[PDB]
Amino acid sequence: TVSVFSMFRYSNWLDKLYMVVGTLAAIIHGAGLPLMMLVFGEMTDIFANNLEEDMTRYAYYYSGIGAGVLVAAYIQVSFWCLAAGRQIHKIRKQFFHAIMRQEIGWFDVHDVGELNTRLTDDVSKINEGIGDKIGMFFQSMATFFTGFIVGFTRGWKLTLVILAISPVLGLSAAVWAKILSSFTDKELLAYAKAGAVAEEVLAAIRTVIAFGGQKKELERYNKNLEEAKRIGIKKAITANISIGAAFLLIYASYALAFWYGTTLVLSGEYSIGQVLTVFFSVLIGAFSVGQASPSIEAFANARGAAYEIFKIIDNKPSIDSYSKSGHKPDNIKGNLEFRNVHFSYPSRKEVKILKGLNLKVQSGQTVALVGNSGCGKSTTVQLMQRLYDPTEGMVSVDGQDIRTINVRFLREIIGVVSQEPVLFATTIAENIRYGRENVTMDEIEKAVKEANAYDFIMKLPHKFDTLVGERGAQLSGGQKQRIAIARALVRNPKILLLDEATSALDTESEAVVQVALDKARKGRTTIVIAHRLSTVRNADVIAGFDDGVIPVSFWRIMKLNLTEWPYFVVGVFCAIINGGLQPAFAIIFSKIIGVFTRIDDPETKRQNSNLFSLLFLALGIISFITFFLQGFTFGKAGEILTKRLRYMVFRSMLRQDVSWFDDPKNTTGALTTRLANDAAQVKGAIGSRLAVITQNIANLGTGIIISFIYGWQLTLLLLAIVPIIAIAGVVEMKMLSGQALKDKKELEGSGKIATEAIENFRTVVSLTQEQKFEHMYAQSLQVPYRNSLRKAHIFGITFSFTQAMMYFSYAGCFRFGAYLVAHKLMSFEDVLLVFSAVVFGAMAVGQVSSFAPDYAKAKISAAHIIMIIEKTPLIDSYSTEGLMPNTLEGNVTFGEVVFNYPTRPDIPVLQGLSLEVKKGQTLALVGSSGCGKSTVVQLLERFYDPLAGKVLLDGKEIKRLNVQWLRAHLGIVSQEPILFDCSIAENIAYGDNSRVVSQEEIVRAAKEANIHAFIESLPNKYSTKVGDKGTQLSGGQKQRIAIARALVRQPHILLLDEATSALDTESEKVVQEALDKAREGRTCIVI
């Protein structure tokens, strides 16, 4: 994604030398096995015909090659794994440095879970990418050319004979298909559109559920998925037909070459040993290409992850603390001011929070600005600390603007006591000493004495010993606030900004906290923000602030993808014949070898000439047909399965309750990933496991049977030796997984420190304690750094020993085989046949098992998919039962209603009020006890379920009525509307999905919403799109569109959720009068 020479950005001279020596050793190692074939052939030629002198000369040659490759095998892996270990340590340490530098305005746009997951996984992905794989790649190439070179030095004809008949071509086509699959994609765009629709619906799940438009969204998703299925089928057809056409062209060219010259073109005189060289070397070189595909896949994934890693690293923030270039004034008596400053959030530019606020505080003063819990409370607190730069105007301290002061020095003289006193999982002494790192115990003691908290600490055991406040005994709000006050006192600031110190903690402990605040407030400027106006009277200046105004894996997966049984039958038959064809190639070669290696026989006989071309054409046609049929059928079956599964899982997700979405385990990102990743790349693996198993069985069993027919002793010897190399590969993968799984345990302290810093990032930047967290992460990396550098020796030794065993296996086979052919028994053609069957079927199945994605994540993904279906039908949106009365009096009564949020049931939200509504009467909950305004909209719409209490609609309990009918007779308007990416006409007709409404109803609703003129003034009357790529609209236009959408339904009860959110105080009159005009003769409840 970025480049090919940019992933190696962090590499000094030593790492460059490591990589160069590693790749040179790999090149030497790769060109060793084909060269051994050459000397083996020389030795056999000499033997077939002083004997000890020739035998011992090549024996030292044979031992000399073996010794060098044994050393080269160690150097190839040892030096590459050291270079990757040194770069990843620098990348991992540098990436976390960049994260701690980005300001607050960037974190809210991104996701903390996404950032932690990326830091945990894509760095490991890069490590796997630039690790030992690259070296392996060169080895394969170092073999490949070498083998062919040998095959083309000792007679080019024979290679051309072996290149066609032998099993080379099918495996080559399989690996070309693997690479093309790894490089094309082209599904991504289609499912990108479909998943854009999916995430648009999922993010707006509240309004979709409240409006009952599940079927319409399901149909839109179905249409997009059908388009994706069509394009995927076309792509699979094109790819498979192209590869098959290449196969057919190769074999037809062979057949034509055999014409126009009756076999004299491809025949010559060859020795008994030369054929062994030009056969085994060519076969090994052609088979080596199968080992270079995982390397290419790994490198591509490494580039993909490194793109995002380097984008985050390279970005330069507008304001950064890691820049010691700024004014550092002394004697800051404190003269903060606001020179009529307008501020708007960078994310929501249209919404304005600070509408030109002016403030002026002298030294040794205090302010008591009073805010509202809904919003407009902590914006000035954030703006003062240079978290967000002002849009218009400026903020100055002591007559000096803060834009010319280094932010690191600026943030170290400001108190930041906030609503929730977040603490870290460490000792209380460390928590108090986080600010002002050069602090002795005496200062901490003095602060806790002037914090009204040491008495409580001493009454409890463990005097500042551990008292962890994250996983241990969770302290009460009062003592946590006292701890935060102590930390602020240790910081020793000059501008104290106590914010929401009386937000949610109980009134029982108000005395101690308030006394501590009053004691600590003396001697410094104070901009206290409070909601209750009964204890901030001690401040010099009091003003009001408001809107700028002052499981287990399961089988039975085959039940899914069952209706498409003819595709499976045809694919299985084609897999059987394709797998069985490859061993038959050995028989064909053993039968026709005698015709391509003799010129003494007159060309008049020419054998037959024509039937050889017929055989080549027949083999080409059969291979083409079988490969095309297998690929097309299995691809089509997999795509149909994934489309149907996506449809069903999306329907199941839509059906279930909103509380399932409210669970923090599954957010919109998790569900999008489930619909995207774990429904298409996994179930295809289970569907094609039948194909791969059938192909492997047909490849191996047929070869074993034909070898047994053509031999007994050598066949049994090879059937005994192949399990040895299989066990060697098992040991290799076991050693790889021994550290691939121990790495997670090793990298656990670093991960927890990183996630603690990232999750609480606002407190970290406020305290300017990023350097300490960076150092802790540095140590938690340093220990696993030594562990990873020690892993290199073990990995190198294991790889070297496995390679030595694989190298010694070939020598033993030739020693025994020559022991059989010399004493008659088996002809050399039979030896070639049995080798090509047994060992080159074992290698072939070993390579094919690497493809066809693993049956490990597919099972857990299938379990997740199955568990998502029929998961929580407790409150089904389209329940069939229930009564639907015709009359609707519109009376809502509440009695002793007690409800708790399922995510946090310990904290109550409903006190058990008694609220009764008559027809044609309006009321608001702002004047109630508070904190219970944004909940009644869930209760009346049956989003949740009251644990204790009762709700009556027109004197009837709402639990018995059908949910769909209840949702179809309620109008809801929120503070802001979310508009789907479609035309305005559909966004207006969305109000009533029971039946299709024509243009007349939409026009009348727009007229009643005072929005018709604006819509008609647009270049497109009703076909204009909205959202991201559409025509952007202001707050008033969106509010009017929402009012029109609500009024299309013609409901009987209206639910307003802070509609008058003070959107610039310019278009409020028109929307207010439209709402008042639409509120006549209808029950309403304003929040």
Author numbering: 33 to 81, 106 to 606, 694 to 1230
What did the article's authors report about this structure?
The ATP-binding cassette (ABC) transporter ABCB1, also known as Multidrug resistance protein (MDR)1 or P-glycoprotein (p-gp) is a ubiquitously expressed drug exporter that plays a key role in cellular drug handling. ABCB1 is a type II ABC exporter/type IV ABC transporter with each transmembrane domain (TMD) comprising 6 transmembrane helices (TMs) and followed by a cytosolic nucleotide-binding domain (NBD). It is topologically arranged as a pseudo-symmetric domain-swapped dimer with the 4th and 5th TMs of each TMD making extensive contacts with the opposing TMDs and NBDs as first revealed by the structure of its bacterial homolog Sav1866. Here we present cryo-EM structures of lipid-embedded human ABCB1 in conformationally distinct apo-, substrate-bound, inhibitor-bound, and nucleotide-trapped states at 3.4–3.9 Å resolution, in the absence of stabilizing antibodies or mutations.
The predominant conformation of apo-ABCB1 observed here features an asymmetric TMD arrangement with a closed central TMD pathway, closely spaced NBDs, and widely spaced extracellular “wings”. We chose to classify this state as an IFCLOSED state based on TMD conformation. The structure is marked by multiple secondary structure (SS) breaks in the TMDs mediated by Glycine and Proline residues and several predicted SS breakers, most noticeably at G317 and G329 that leads to an elongation of extracellular loop (ECL)3 and wide separation between TM5 and TM6. Closing of the central TMD pathway is facilitated by TM4, which adopts a kinked conformation with secondary structure breaks at P223 and K242, effectively dividing it into three sub-helices (TM4a-c). In conjunction with TM6 and TM12, it forms a central 3TM bundle that closes off the central cavity. In contrast to TM4, TM10 adopts a straight conformation, contributing further to structural asymmetry and leading to a lateral opening to the lower bilayer leaflet. These features lead to an overall conformation that diverges widely from canonical IF open conformations as demonstrated by a comparison to the alphafold-predicted structure of ABCB1. The IFCLOSED state that is dominant from our analysis is incompatible with substrate binding, with TM4 involved in 3TM bundle formation to close the TMD pathway and also sterically occluding the substrate-binding site. As such, TM4 may play an autoinhibitory role and act as an affinity filter akin to the regulatory domains of ABCC-type transporters. First, the IFCLOSED apo state lays the foundation for the development of a new class of ABCB1 inhibitors that could potentially trap it, thereby preventing substrate access to the TMD.
